[PDB]
Nucleic acid binder design. Sequence first.
RNA 1: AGGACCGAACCGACUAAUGUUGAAAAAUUAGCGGAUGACUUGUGGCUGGGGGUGAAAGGCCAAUCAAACCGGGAGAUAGCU
RNA 2: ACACAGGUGGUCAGGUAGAGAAUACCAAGGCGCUUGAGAGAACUCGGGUGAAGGAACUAGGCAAAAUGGUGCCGUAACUUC
RNA 3: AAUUCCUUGUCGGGUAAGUUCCGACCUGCACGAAUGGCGUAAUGAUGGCCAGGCUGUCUCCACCCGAGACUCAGUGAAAU
RNA 4: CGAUGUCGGCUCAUCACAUCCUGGGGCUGAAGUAGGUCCCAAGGGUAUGGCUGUUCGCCAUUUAAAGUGGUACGCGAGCUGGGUUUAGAACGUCGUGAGACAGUUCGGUCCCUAUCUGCCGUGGGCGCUGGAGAACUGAGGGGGGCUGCUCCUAGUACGAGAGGACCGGAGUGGACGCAUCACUGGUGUUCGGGUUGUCAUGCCAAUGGCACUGCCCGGUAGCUAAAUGCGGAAGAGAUAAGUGCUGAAAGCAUCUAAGCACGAAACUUGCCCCGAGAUGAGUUCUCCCUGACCCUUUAAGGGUCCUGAAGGAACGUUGAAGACGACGACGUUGAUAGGCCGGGUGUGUAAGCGCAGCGAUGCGUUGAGCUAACCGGUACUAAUGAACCGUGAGGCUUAACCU
Lengths: 114, 209, 120, 122, 56
Amino acid sequence: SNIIKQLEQEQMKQDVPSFRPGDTVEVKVWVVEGSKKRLQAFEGVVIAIRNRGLHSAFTVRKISNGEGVERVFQTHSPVVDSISVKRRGAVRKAKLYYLRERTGKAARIKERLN
Amino acid sequence: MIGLVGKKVGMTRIFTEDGVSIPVTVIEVEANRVTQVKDLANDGYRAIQVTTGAKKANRVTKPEAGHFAKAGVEAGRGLWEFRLAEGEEFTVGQSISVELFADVKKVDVTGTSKGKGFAGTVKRWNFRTQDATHGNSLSHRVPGSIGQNQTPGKVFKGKKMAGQMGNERVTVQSLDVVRVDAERNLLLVKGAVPGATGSDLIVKPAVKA
Amino acid sequence: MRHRKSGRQLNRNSSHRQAMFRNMAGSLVRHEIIKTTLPKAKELRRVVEPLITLAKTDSVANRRLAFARTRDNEIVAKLFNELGPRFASRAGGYTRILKCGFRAGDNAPMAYIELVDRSE
Amino acid sequence: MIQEQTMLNVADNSGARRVMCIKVLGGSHRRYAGVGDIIKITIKEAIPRGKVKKGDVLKAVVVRTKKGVRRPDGSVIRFDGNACVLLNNNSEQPIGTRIFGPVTRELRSEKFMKIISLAPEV
Amino acid sequence: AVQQNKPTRSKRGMRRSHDALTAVTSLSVDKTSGEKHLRHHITADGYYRGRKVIAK
RNA sequence: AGGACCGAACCGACUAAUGUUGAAAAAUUAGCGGAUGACUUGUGGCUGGGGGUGAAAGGCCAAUCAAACCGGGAGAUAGCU
RNA sequence: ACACAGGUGGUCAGGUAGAGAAUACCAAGGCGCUUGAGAGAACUCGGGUGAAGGAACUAGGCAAAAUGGUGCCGUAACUUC
RNA sequence: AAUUCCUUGUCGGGUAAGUUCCGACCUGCACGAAUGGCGUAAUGAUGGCCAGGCUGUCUCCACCCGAGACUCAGUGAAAU
RNA sequence: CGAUGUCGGCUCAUCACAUCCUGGGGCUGAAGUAGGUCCCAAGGGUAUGGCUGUUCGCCAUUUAAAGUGGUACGCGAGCUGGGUUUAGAACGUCGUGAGACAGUUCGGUCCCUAUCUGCCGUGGGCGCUGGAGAACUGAGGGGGGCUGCUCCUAGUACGAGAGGACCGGAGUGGACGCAUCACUGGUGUUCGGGUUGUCAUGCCAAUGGCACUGCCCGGUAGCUAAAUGCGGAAGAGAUAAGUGCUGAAAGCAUCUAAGCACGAAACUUGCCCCGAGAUGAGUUCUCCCUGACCCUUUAAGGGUCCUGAAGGAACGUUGAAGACGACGACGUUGAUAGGCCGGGUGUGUAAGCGCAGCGAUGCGUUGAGCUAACCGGUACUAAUGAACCGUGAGGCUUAACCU
């Protein structure tokens, strides 16, 4: 698959920041509303990262004014404009799906700081 | 028009500029090179026989090698044949490239599908399973009844029963061609085409309107 | 329907296969040539040859890592003391299978699997 | 992916608190409701002096699902809990005046424009 | 579930038309020992492709 | 204390699945009821065929029970096959 | 009837965890069940997991899933207390 | 009503919708007082109905682990 | 009656048309919208639930519609066993009673390893007239045909207004089918980790066995669906009902008698698949074989020697092919499988050692170690030289050419 490997890496964006699950992340996303092309922000804990080159996703979980939301993002989509890491987070797993069962003080991730 | 013989390289996606992922299948279409031209005056129908790829010298037999040697062409991995469309003209030894699809806008892709072996009627024919409990005695995935009673006292032809699913010619129609890349010899069509990776495809222009 | 799956099942469950290859790898390291069935030989390659390559690099973590697999201490003495420095330049291909007929008891296709030196 | 017999939460303040889906409208043998699809519901629980009382049968539109919606780039948006807004039965455009929680960009249509005029996110 | 007329010996042999065993079909001769063996197998003396192996 | 409670041995047999030319002429597996009592069990004894015994089902009386098994009357009789 | 997955009374009863003769892993001791080798189709049997939904199944929640310990708090109608 | 034919009686409760269920009425075809009447706490591998939880029961099946099934070697039935 | 299992449910159908929807059309007490009624039409489509054993029915909410029948009231060697209709028991009633009631109620064993036909798949033999390798045409056969809603045309036509089109076009759904794994997920007892009890490796540390994979948490490839692509068409021909044009018999009239034109999801094609056993066994291209000598009851006769081609088969390494055969790839002038190397992925920062802490533990080396089926390479191992099968120019007659 040098054809496919050569063909996908022509599309991979270069400046994707290094983040790992547990991190609070603001993701800025192009949202189109008719003619105006707005850019809105989705901040939450990374609970899952799939690395597959171009087909790399990451799931961000927010508790939005009420109930909880999980956006899975394709990392190399042109929709996903910015990824910035707000708070670096210290966890032990690789997929943090237990946090789907926890709210508030139980869903509280220590900071990494190294 | 005619088609070209490809090879299923696999699947990827193509992010558009406005952020719409398109699932594409990559089909490497090398130089299909014409080995025989068929006319009404000798065969009753106008068609070209092309070959593609390359074969080992010791693995091609003497009949086959004599055929490609007459054509004045390198031996490929197979011979295929395309029916011609009344105003088209090809010569023997002429090479045909993916550039032919630089106008076509939508194609039909024909391959052999993935062989699923002896399949039961729930996989094969989408029969619905009977109860998984409530008394049922050894008949969960079985086909049920297969016909009527004394009248007819036979099972009709083409009753859907279990047997070999997969591994047969299927044509997927009206796939949007996303890119034609004459440099790398590639054709990116939108969607899934039949076959496992590396399987030989046949990409023609779409006959539907 | 199996497509691209690797690994014979050998009419055993997973723990009996694991145990069986642990013993049979121990026997091939011990005696340097054993007679088994042809499928059990062909799976014994994929168990045995990784122990030789682990043995090509002697450290406490590889001795313990080759004692988790194989579970015998004489075996991880011969690996790391004899076989690992024996091959040492041989890149794969530590063992050959030689088909040798059929059993009498059940007509099974036997095969002698052996290490690839045995210059003694 | 809301089907019959499914208990949905209520996103507006119409008075209902917990509803059950009784049909998925819009086709024959249609199985699932979804992103912004209309269902028929019955009200299984209400607050004591809301506009809708217990055991009423009316329409609703699904605004959030646990299964989620897929965007055209491949990105999904799953919620935690299925939710609907109770539309009026005859001529739609819903009962309640507030809308709680977020909604999605796939109620961006004519009718549900009302629902996304409210609705603090998305 | 059981037959309804006894099948003949004709139909019986017709069914057994395929039960025939195929011969070996020719077994190969060793390079050094010059003795015969199945192909791709070792000989009775324990040679294979002209070199000595097992030796029990 | 208890025809007490939970629960093994022990006695049983409510459900399901398998089995149904069975591994088995009534079982196996997973759950199930009783489990100091009107309990359960070993060894011996007693009751016998229109008779026994029966917390009663026409149940049980040696894989047999609206009248055991064996032998005899007996080659019953059979306007029926 | 079988070298039969059944039946058969008493006696001895170690370790660790455990209330325990339950249960798990072990000791003494005894076994691997008298056809094997492959392959890894449908289908059947015994099991594991399952998106969203959660009895819509169905004669019927049959089956499965769930619950499950010890201590403490707390506990309604009704009652023969 | 373990009793009611007509009958899914009529009204009410539960349900989006209830021939079943609960309450009531009484025109009891064909209840009824030790072949007991009516109540009845506790009990029941008892019958019927409802709800919470729970789930592959199901929507609609998918994959996996094992034992057969399939191939090879040995033995080698049966009903008909 | 030396047994033809009988309701209902499930699974699986299949035909008829007296058509429920979709399609065409005539009359209308048809303005439009919506209808009523009748002719044509069988392509495809033609609910989910409450109650009840129920078919039915009533109800709730859908739908374009929820057709009517035949098929042993289709289907129990396909499933169930709720009902009817065994043996237990009770109620009401009948009988003095044993009992009895298609009155009611509770409980209650559904066997079969397929020989033949049929059907679904899949091979072996032989034929097709020398052998062999491929590519084909296509007789014929099968699959597929469903449809909503929104928008424009146009708030036009019609109508007093309310309301509201025909014909034509664009979009987007439902149900169904095919493919596929890029995405989202499921699984992933073969990968990594956490952790309980216990046993062992002498012991600490580290590991391993067993407890449903011990219980769990993630997860590669593959398979998959709830995932994502695509499909049902346009068009042509011959028509049904129907509408006509010209036109007599019948100096008018008249769609028909001569002649001519329209006309539907039905019909034949168009689309997809199988397909030369299509014994009517076809076509095209290519490849190979260019020896002698006897015998006779002189035949497309038999035999001996020498030759053994093209190719196939066997064997081996095997495969996104597979029950087995089959099919595909490769066999050393070689990446076919395994190993190995690099990468990726997954898990989540190994062991050892050092430091902090009384200790559990924490931190550093360290995103470390380990990584299955993945990807790119590499002859290290195994794919052996050979043998085997297959021959030696391919009948007769007639015709046209031998330029």
